[PDB]
Amino acid sequence: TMNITSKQMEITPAIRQHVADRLAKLEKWQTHLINPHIILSKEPQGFVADATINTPNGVLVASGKHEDMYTAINELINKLERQLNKLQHKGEARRAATSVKDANFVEEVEEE
Numbered sequence: 228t229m230n231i232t233s234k235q236m237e238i239t240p241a242i243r244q245h246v247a248d249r250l251a252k253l254e255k256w257q258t259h260l261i262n263p264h265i266i267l268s269k270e271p272q273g274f275v276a277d278a279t280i281n282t283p284n285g286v287l288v289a290s291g292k293h294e295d296m297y298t299a300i301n302e303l304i305n306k307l308e309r310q311l312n313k314l315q316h317k318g319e320a321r322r323a324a325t326s327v328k329d330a331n332f333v334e335e336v337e338e339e
Contacts, residue, residue, distance in 0.1 A: 233267035242300070249304055256311045259283050267300065276303040287311070 229247055231238050246265065259282035268275040273294035280287045289306035291299035 228262065230262070230264045231267065232264070235269045236267065236296075242297075245297070246300060246304065249301075253308065253311075256308060258311075265300070265303070267296070269296075274299045276300045278303050278307060280307065284314075287314075 229243075229250055231243065231246060260280045261282060263278065263280040265276065265278040268277070270292070273292060274296040276291045276296075276299040278289045287307065287310045289303045289310060291302035291306070293299040293302055
């Protein structure tokens with residue numbers, strides 16, 4: 228449901244509650260995701276946070292590299308949210324100028 232690991236620092240209840248609090252908040256997003264995993268790294272230029280989630284309809288990925296450890300984690304999940312947004316899509320929607328009518332079942336699967 229929420230796994231956080233790092234090869235530099237340790238997992239604190241604050242970092243767990245921070246990310247965790249955001250998970251429970253992502254209700255509109257709640258649809259799939261099975262056993263997500265987040266990793267935390269660090270570079271001389273700042274901190275980096277990566278995350279991977281497996282779902283029944285594919286897999287999503289997100290990463291961050293802000294100078295602030297907390298900002299990176301927040302940014303990463305930001306991409307998780309921003310990613311799920313594109314999953315639902317929206318399109319432009321277009322009917323016609325009058326009404327028209329075109330649809331066939333006899334031939335719309337074999338070649339289509």
